[PDB]
């Protein structure tokens, strides 16, 4: 429904870039893949 580094929000009915959730308390499960292995530069 979305991309490799995107997750779906049912309440918005929208694809969201997982980058916006790395700093979450609990990033979505399909996002931990990308956020735990990112880079801050």
């Amino acid at each position, epitope marked *: 429904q979305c991309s490799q580094n995107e997750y779906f929000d049912s*309440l918005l009915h929208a694809c969201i870039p997982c980058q916006l959730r790395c700093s979450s308390n609990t990033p979505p499960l399909t996002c931990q893949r990308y956020c735990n292995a990112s880079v801050t530069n």
Partner: nanobody
Amino acid sequence: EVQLVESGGGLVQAGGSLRLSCAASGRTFTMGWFRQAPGKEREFVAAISLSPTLAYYAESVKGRFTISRDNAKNTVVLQMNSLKPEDTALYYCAADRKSVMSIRPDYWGQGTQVTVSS
């Protein structure tokens, strides 16, 4: 708090274009747009984040609507092309002090009517 003022609404025809803009008195991390049709729940349309500028859209407007924001001016713009009669709704602009737009945001607009004639 933060006040949001909307601009640009009105009458358009099927297949036409229309530019809505929203001016905020303050800066929040998330800006965007919802819409409410007569006899339907308010639904999310689009949103964009402060840094990085990442735009995300509802499934029903992707590929037809785009969104941008001016961080210095604290403005957020919804550019609509390929308008359909079912795009007729009250378009509210919204601000959120969250990383992703919530359906219960901090700040709402008065909403501006957008009517797509056939």
